[PDB]
């Protein structure tokens, strides 16, 4: 078993094993997570 | 080149802000775009005008439009005025000195609401960025920020240092604990937005987008984990538009209370609060009525709850205005009459009185007692003109023609006209000719102060342009009926002379200063040049993607400039009709272009709110003039070139006058600090029987521990080898002190283990050789609980491993 | 749709109030219904930290006992994920231990999908057991230091 993507569409699950619901996030935390994903896709 | 700066700005009575009434009908503090006006309601004359400074057009002036005023709050006791701006700036003004005291910058968007505390030492500000910040005026700093809401702050209520109820444009009511800076309660006020909030004792009233109004009861001491706010009832107001403001007023003598709900339409709806004796009397009556009707007791109880609002509220009277209402404010409450003042979205102030006796008012409609209208115009000015003597300024809008004095900035005369589209003075400055949108030509006289002549059938459609010959005896008018007509001035009436029928609609007509050419702009993107003397077609100018809106011919009849809706200014040679230069001038339609007299420099204004000063020989912008907030419709240049006038959609007429440590090294620093304090307390405790740590707000153990966490594991083993032995005995003391805190020990048990064991392995030889008996007891203590902490985790791990195989084994047996 | 929305606003607010107050038994129940995985992790993390000073405490243990089949599958899925990371496995093990000591082991087996979740927890827990055990061995250097210092 290996941690993968979030089964639910409203959550972020990282390979670190940490899950994050979009509802519980503050606005500032949602921004950096959005930018973090952008870096991952840019080089990919 | 010689610099242009704004000499004066006028024409605005009340902009898009609130109004602050100050008792002596007293005065009213209103916004004038980036300035603040203080009007005397009785006389109707401007008392003062607050302007920060830095006139537009000056070199030190900024390169964007100034931020306008959006909210006004005054502390009556202390005579301070807070002004919020559209860029999120607050400026506290000294009303007596008329100078800025404080300048707060903590909001990213326009400020929606300001409120001094009762004592006048704190200022609470909400903004469109959804934040509420509490400011300290004596400290000139922002105390704390309240960051729960997710849209613009529409209202809030804070009458004490303990609690603050706030409303936002996301439809929530939030109750805040101002000692802890957290939101305690959150309710959905309305399904969409929530626009109003007024609180009186327990009673709280909120308005949303629709006509529904909710009633809440405010039990602050409820402390039930909820229910400090409970919804009581819903009552419908007459207006189906959103209720923007709610304000309460209490009559001191009788203790009767009223509130209004300012609507986004032209109405204000006043309400009265029924006294408790009235409520009981009404309840007993209606219960008798319902009982006589045969309803059950339980049904009556539910019906009373259904009609709960009707017992406490009573629609009192509806104030109706001719213009949409922008802001309102209670002024005076008395047993005789009830007074309200408001500003409209059409540049005026209105004062209303409601005389009443007991429950219901005496007169069917409120009495409009005062108004301020003379020093402005209700609609936006579409054309302006300056008399040949450069002393008067005519400004023609939809419904009125007002004539101003450029020196005093005061309107001298006002005439009622149609939908004026173009105006020009006649020579001598004593007459003005208008072309309205219905096809009418109207001619006024300033001295007589009346309309001399009207030509209803001058054109079949809107007279879009209007020009006079230099002699002043001939008038050329172009219309959207696709004709240019010529008129003569004979003693003074207008007589139609000739007609010239064109192919398409006419947007502009210009006659050259030499009276030799007539340039006509057509809706088919071309400008046609004629010979005025013979009316022989001479040229057609092509090159504009979109229609030409303005034309202007130079003082020597050599160049012609044209400006279009395609954002370009083209400069043509009138010898052949060739385009010398095409400038991409503005970011929107360029409405007007004017040559400076006796020069080739020219001005331009656009819908992008910028006026630009250009060079006619170099085709370069000399100066960008940022003062207006909205479209600049009209522009005018004095005959001497000494000043320029521009009027905009924002009701303002503006006159422009010509004027490091590495890891391990950091660890040693933390060990020196943390253990110096630990030893101090330990020595202090024994006898009884710093700034850094206080600033960070951490214990000595946690402060050292956080430094260990920040060290990368690849740098950690080398960071420990550089440590001298004396720092190792310090490290063993830090570990010993950590062991007493079981929460820290199990939080970072693995990291303590690797670092501790590596230290002992690295310098075991020097550790064992020491004959310190205190060191023996530290290692002995650190040993025991390190095992017990380690064994505790292992016992849990081993137990689940055997437990989980058992589950897997039994599922196998039951399913194989 | 308005009454569920109104309720979800109250539960989100109440969850924040409980966490700030430190009412973890009530924060746990709201976090599970709302399905807020971090707040669940923080509530369990800082509830465990207080336990250091049966498993979690008398009250929060009771809350875990009354969980229904749907909630258990949700909670064990988080425990499976937290277990894969050595920096957060300690919280997962104590949560797993509480479930076994307050639920019927037979009943846990029939729940559809539990065995596959359990199958993914065992291999990681063995890796965590091999470690920590090795840390116990390494801790005996303190014995060898003490006997040397006695000499």
What is the rounded end-to-end Cα distance, in angstroms, of chain A?
Answer: 24
Beta pairing class for B132-136 and B122-127:
antiparallel
Beta bridge partners of B354: B338
Gap between the Cα atoms of B500 and B478, Å rounded: 9
Rounded CA separation B205/B271 (Å): 12
Residue with tokens 């013979």: B534
Helix (H) or strand (E) holding C74: helix C69-84
Look up residue B474 and give its DSSP letter.
Answer: E
Angle at B25 between CA B23 and CA B29, to 5 degrees: 60
Closest CA to B83 of B63, B99, B62, B59: B99
Q: Please judge whether B801 and C129 are an interchain contact, meaning their C-beta atoms are less than 8 angstroms apart.
A: yes
CA distance B255 to B260: 17
Rounded CA separation B84/B125 (Å): 9
Question: CA torsion B299→B304→B306→B310, rounded to 10°?
Answer: 150
CB contact under 8 Å between A2 and C123, yes or no, is no
Decide: B646 and B659 in contact? Cβ < 8 Å: no
Rounded CA-CA distance C37/C32 in Å is 8
CA distance B769 to B763: 10
Instruction: Return the structure tokens found at B565.
Output: 């809706």
Structural contact between residues B629 and B65, judged by C-beta atoms closer than 8 angstroms: yes
Rg (CA), chain B: 39
Residues of A in contact with C12 (CB under 8 A): 23
For C97, other C-beta atoms within 10 Å of its C-beta total: 19
Structure token pair of residue A5? 């993507």
CA dist B656 → B6, B424, B554 (Å):
4, 20, 21
Q: Is A26 within 8 Å of chain C by CB?
A: no
Task: Find chains touching chain C: ≥3 CB pairs under 8 Å.
Answer: A, B
B73 closest CA partner among B104, B131, B31? B31
- Torsion, CA B783, CA B784, CA B785, CA B786, rounded to 10: 40
Contact A26, C38 (CB under 8 A): no
Nearest to C93 by CA among C122, C62, C134, C61: C122
- Token pair of B566 as six digits: 């395609």
Sole residue written with tokens 């039951």: B814
* Environment class of A44 (CB within 10 Å of its CB; exposed 0-12, middle 13-18, buried 19+): exposed
Say how far apart CA B248 and CA B263 lie, in whole Å: 15
Nearest CB neighbour to B226, from listed C10, C108, C125: C10
In Å, how far is A29's CA from the nearest CA of chain C?
A: 13
Give me the count of residues in chain B. 816
Distance, in Å, from the CA atom of B178 to the CA atom of B159, rounded to the nearest integer, reads: 12
Residue B58 is classified by DSSP as: S
Residue B796 near residue C97 (C-beta atoms within 8 A): yes
Q: How far apart are CA B128 and CA B153, in angstroms?
A: 6
Distances (CA, A) of B245 to B167, B259, B330, B331, C89: 12, 10, 12, 15, 55
Token pair in block for residue B388: 């040949």
Asked if C85 and A23 come within 8 Å (Cβ–Cβ), the reply is: no
CA distance B592 to B527: 15
Rounded-to-integer distance, Cα B792 and Cα C90, Å = 11
- The data reach a resolution, in angstroms, of 2.7
What token pair was written down for B242? 């959103």
Contact in structure between B574 and B568 (CB atoms under 8 Å)? no
**Residue pointed to by tokens 């405790």:** B685
**C34 to chain A: which residues are within 8 Å by CB?**
21, 23-24
Where on the phi/psi map is residue B429: left (φ > 0), alpha (ψ -120 to 50), or beta? left
Strand stretches in B542-652, DSSP E: 548-553, 559-564, 568-573, 579-584, 590-595, 602-606, 610-614, 621-626, 632-637, 643-648
The torsion angle over the Cα atoms of residues C118, C121, C127 and C128, rounded to 10 degrees, is -120
Of the candidates C59, C54, C131, which has an alpha carbon nearest to the alpha carbon of residue C100? C54
Nearest to B584 by CA among B600, B604, B602, B569: B569
Q: With an 8 Å Cβ cutoff, is A19 touching chain C? A: yes
Residues in CB range of B468: below 8 A, 6 or more apart: B424, B426, B433, B474, B475, B476, B511
Joined together, the tokens standing for residue B392 give 């008067």
Token pair listed for B310: 């009707």
* SS3 per residue for B134-194: EEECCCCEEEEEECCCCCCEEEEECCCCCEEEEEECCCEEEEEECCCCEEEEEEECCCCCE
> And the tokens for B40?
């005397």
CB-CB: which of C12, C78, C120 is closest to A19? C78
CB B633 within 8 Å of CB B649? yes
Angle at B46 between CA B54 and CA B318, to 5 degrees: 115
Mapping DSSP to helix (H, G, I), strand (E, B) and coil, where does residue C147 land? helix
**Angle, in degrees to the nearest 10, between helices B749-762 and B725-740:** 150
B764 contacts C136? CB cut-off 8 A: no
Residue B477 tokens read as 């008018």
Taking CB atoms and an 8 Å limit, are B800 and C125 in contact across chains?
Answer: yes
Query: How far does the CA of residue B159 sit from the closest CA of chain C (Å)?
Result: 24
> How far is the CA of B595 from the CAs of B8, B319, B600, B642, in angstroms?
22, 49, 6, 13
Written as six digits, the tokens of C12 are: 């989100």
**CA distances in angstroms from B513 to B234, B421, B479, B552, listed in the order given:** 69, 22, 22, 10
B371 C-beta neighbours (distance < 10 Å), count? 13
Residue C9 has its nearest CB partner, among B186, B794, B800, at B186
Query: Residue B716 and residue B259: Cα distance in Å, rounded?
Result: 69
Q: What's the CA gap between B16 and B30, in Å, rounded?
A: 9
Give residues preceding each break in chain A, C–N over 2.5 A: none
Say if residues B779 and C145 touch (Cβ distance below 8 Å): yes
Q: Look at strands B153-157 and B141-146 and give their pairing.
A: unpaired
Using DSSP's 3-state secondary structure scheme, residue B60 falls into coil
Q: CA B315, B319, B323 angle in degrees (round to 5)?
A: 145
Burial C100-122 (b: 16+ CB within 10 A, else e): bebeeeeebbebeebbebbebbb
- Token pair listed for B815: 């399913």
The owner of tokens 């020069």 is B599
Q: What angle do CA B739, C28, B165 make, to 5 degrees?
A: 110
Task: From B416, B436, B424, B433, select the one nearest B634 (Cα to Cα).
Answer: B424
Contact B796 C94 (CB under 8 A): yes
Tokens at B371, concatenated: 């108004």
| Distance separating alpha carbons of residues B153 and C89, to the nearest angstrom | 43
Closest CA to C91 of B515, B156, B793: B793
Count of CA atoms in the C-beta half-sphere (13 A) of B69: 31
Q: Are B486 and B495 in contact (CB under 8 A)?
A: no
Torsion sign over Cα B790, B795, B800, B806: positive
* CA–CA separation, C136 and B802 (whole Å): 20
What lies within 8 Å, CB to CB, of B447 at 6+ separation is: B430
* C142/B226 CB distance under 8 A: no
Pairing type for strands B610-614 and B602-606 reads antiparallel
Ramachandran area for residue C9 (φ above 0: left; ψ -120 to 50: alpha; else beta): alpha
CA distance A10 to C80: 20
C2-21 and C37-52 are packed helices; what angle lies between their axes, rounded to 10 degrees?
30
B334 touching chain C per CB within 8 A: no
Q: What is the DSSP string of B746-771?
A: HHTHHHHHHHHHHHHHHTHHHHHH--
Residue matched to tokens 């065995």: C115
Task: Give the C-alpha separation, C90 to C112, whole Å.
Answer: 26
Q: How many CA atoms lie within 13 A of B626 on its CB side?
A: 13
Residues B335/B322, Cβ–Cβ less than 8 Å: no
Q: Note whether C102 and C61 are within 8 A (CB).
A: yes
The DSSP result for B326-384, as a single string, is EEEEEEEE-SSEEEEEEEETTTEEEEEEEEEETTEESSSS-EEEEEE-TTS-SSPP-EE
Interface of C with A in 57-76 (CB under 8 A): none
| Cα torsion B233, B236, B237, B243: sign | positive
Closest in C94, C119, C126 to B808, CB measured: C119
Cα separation of B96 and B644, whole Å? 34
Q: Are B274 and B254 in contact (CB under 8 A)?
A: no
Nearest C-alpha neighbor of B519 from the set B488, B489, B563, B487: B563
DSSP B488-540: EEE--EEEEEEEEE-SS-EEEEEE-TTS-EEEEEETTS-EEEEETTTTEEEEE
* Unique residue bearing structure tokens 């039990």: B219
List chain A residues with CB under 8 Å of C38: 18-21, 24
CA angle B551/B584/B589 to nearest 5° reads 55
Paired with B595 in beta bridges are B602
The residues, ordered by sequence, that sit 6+ positions from B513 with a Cβ below 8 Å of its Cβ are B470, B553, B554, B555, B557
Query: Rounded CA gap, B417 and B578, in Å?
Result: 41
Burial class (CB in 10 A: 0-12, 13-18, 19+), B517: buried
Dihedral-angle region of residue B423 (phi above 0 means left; psi in -120 to 50 means alpha; beta otherwise) = beta
Give yes or no for a contact between B71 and B18, defined as CB atoms under 8 angstroms apart. yes
Return the number of other C-beta atoms located less than 10 Å from residue B546's C-beta. Answer: 13
B328 forms beta bridges with B342
> In the numeric block, which tokens belong to residue C117?
């979740």
Long-range residue pairs from B607-610, CB within 8 A, at least 24 positions apart, any chain = B607/B631, B607/B632, B609/B65, B609/B648, B610/B586
């Amino acid at each position: 078993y290996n941690v993968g993507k979030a089964e639910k569409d409203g959550e972020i699950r990282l390979k670190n094993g940490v899950a994050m619901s979009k509802e519980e996030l503050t606005r500032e935390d949602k921004n950096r997570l959005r930018r973090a994903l952008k870096r991952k896709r840019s080089k990919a | 080149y010689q610099r242009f700066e704004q000499a004066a700005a006028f024409g605005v009575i009340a902009s898009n802000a609130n109004c602050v009434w100050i008792p002596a009908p007293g005065q009213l503090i209103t916004s004038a775009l980036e300035d603040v006006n203080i009007w005397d309601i009785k006389t109707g004359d401007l008392v003062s005008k607050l302007s920060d400074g830095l006139p537009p057009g000056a070199s030190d002036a900024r390169g964007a439009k100034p931020a306008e005023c959006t909210y006004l709050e005054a502390h009556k006791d202390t005579d301070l005025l807070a002004v919020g701006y559209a860029d999120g700036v607050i400026k506290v003004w000294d009303l007596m000195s008329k100078t800025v005291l404080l300048n707060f910058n903590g909001h990213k968007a326009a400020i929606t609401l300001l409120q001094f505390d009762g004592t006048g030492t704190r200022l609470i500000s909400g903004s469109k960025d959804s934040n509420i910040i509490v400011w300290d005026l004596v400290g000139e700093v922002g105390l704390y920020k309240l960051r729960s809401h997710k849209d613009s702050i529409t209202g809030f209520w804070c009458q004490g240092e303990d609690w603050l109820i706030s409303t936002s444009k996301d439809g929530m009511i939030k109750l805040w604990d101002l000692k802890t800076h957290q939101c305690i309660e959150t309710h959905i006020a309305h399904t969409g937005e929530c626009w109003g909030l007024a609180v009186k004792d327990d009673l709280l009233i909120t308005t949303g987008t629709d006509s529904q109004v909710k009633i809440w009861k405010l039990d602050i001491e409820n402390d039930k984990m909820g229910g400090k706010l409970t919804e009581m009832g819903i009552f419908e107001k007459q207006s189906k538009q959103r209720g923007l403001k709610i304000e309460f007023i209490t009559n001191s003598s009788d203790k009767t209370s009223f509130f209004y709900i300012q609507n986004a339409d032209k109405t204000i709806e006043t309400f009265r609060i029924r006294k408790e004796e009235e409520i009981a009397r009404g309840l007993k009556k209606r219960e008798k009525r319902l009982k006589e009707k045969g309803l059950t007791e339980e049904e009556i109880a539910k019906s009373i709850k259904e009609s709960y609002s009707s017992f406490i509220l009573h629609p009192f009277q509806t104030i109706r205005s001719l213009y949409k209402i922008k802001s309102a404010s209670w002024t005076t409450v008395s047993s005789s009459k009830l007074e309200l003042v408001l500003t409209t979205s059409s540049n005026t102030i209105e004062y209303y009185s409601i005389p009443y006796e007991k429950r219901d008012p005496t007169s069917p409609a409120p009495l409009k007692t005062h108004t301020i209208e003379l020093q402005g115009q209700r609609t936006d000015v579409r054309s302006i003109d300056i008399s040949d003597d450069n002393k008067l300024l005519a400004t023609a809008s939809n419904g009125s023609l007002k004539i101003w004095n450029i020196k005093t900035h005061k309107c001298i005369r006002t005439f009622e006209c149609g939908y004026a589209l173009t105006c020009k003075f006649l020579p001598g400055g004593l007459l003005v000719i208008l072309g309205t949108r219905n096809g009418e030509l109207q001619l006024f006289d300033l001295a007589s102060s009346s309309l001399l002549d009207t030509i209803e059938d001058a054109h079949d459609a809107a007279i879009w342009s209007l020009d006079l010959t230099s002699d002043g005896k001939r008038l050329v008018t172009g219309s959207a009926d696709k004709t240019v007509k010529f008129w003569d001035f004979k003693v003074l009436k207008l007589h139609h002379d000739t007609t010239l029928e064109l192919t398409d609609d006419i947007l502009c007509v210009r006659v050259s200063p030499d009276d030799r050419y007539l340039a006509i702009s057509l809706l088919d993107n071309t400008v046609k040049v004629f010979f005025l003397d013979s009316m022989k077609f001479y040229l057609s100018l092509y090159g504009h993607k979109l229609p030409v809106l303005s034309i202007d011919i130079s003082f020597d009849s050599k160049m012609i400039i044209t400006s279009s809706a395609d954002k370009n200014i083209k400069i043509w040679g009138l010898d052949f009709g060739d385009c010398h230069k095409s400038l991409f001038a503005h970011q929107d339609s360029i409405m007007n272009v004017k040559f400076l007299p006796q020069s080739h420099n020219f001005f331009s204004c656009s819908k992008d709110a910028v006026v630009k000063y250009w060079d006619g020989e170099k085709f370069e912008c000399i100066q960008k003039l940022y003062a207006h907030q909205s479209e600049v419709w009209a522009l005018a240049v004095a005959t001497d070139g000494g000043f320029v006038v521009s009027s905009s959609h924002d009701h303002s007429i503006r006159i422009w006058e010509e004027t490091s440590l590495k890891a391990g090294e950091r660890l040693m620093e933390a060990l020196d600090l943390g253990i110096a304090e630990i030893e101090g307390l330990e020595a202090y405790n024994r006898d009884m029987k710093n700034a850094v740590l206080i600033a960070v707000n951490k214990t000595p153990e946690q402060y050292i521990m956080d430094t260990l966490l920040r060290i990368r594991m690849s740098q950690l083993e080398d960071a420990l080898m550089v440590m001298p032995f004396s720092y190792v005995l310090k490290f063993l003391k830090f570990i010993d002190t950590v062991m007493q805190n079981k929460t820290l020990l199990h939080s970072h048990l693995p990291l303590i283990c690797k670092n501790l064991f590596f230290i002992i392995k690295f310098n075991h030889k020097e550790l064992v050789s020491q004959k310190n008996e205190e060191l023996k007891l530290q290692i002995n203590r650190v040993k025991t609980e390190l095992r017990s902490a380690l064994k505790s985790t292992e016992d849990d791990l081993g137990f689940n491993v055997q437990g989980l195989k058992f589950v897997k084994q039994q599922w196998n047996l039951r399913h194989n | 749709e308005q009454e569920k929305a109104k309720l979800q606003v109250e539960q989100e607010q109440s969850l924040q109030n409980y966490m700030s107050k430190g009412d973890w038994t009530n924060a746990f129940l709201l976090a599970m219904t709302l399905d807020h995985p971090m707040r669940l992790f923080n509530v369990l993390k800082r509830a465990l930290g207080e336990s250091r000073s049966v498993i979690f405490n008398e009250e929060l243990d009771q809350a875990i006992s009354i969980l229904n089949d749907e909630q258990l599958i949700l909670l064990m899925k988080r425990c499976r994920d937290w277990n894969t990371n050595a920096k957060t496995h300690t919280i997962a093990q104590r949560t797993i231990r509480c479930i076994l000591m307050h639920h019927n082991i037979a009943k846990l087996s029939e729940i559809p999908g539990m065995v596959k979740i359990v199958d993914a927890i065992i291999p990681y827990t063995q890796r965590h057991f091999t470690r920590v055990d090795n840390l116990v061995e390494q801790s005996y250097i303190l014995d060898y230091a003490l006997v040397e210092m006695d000499k």
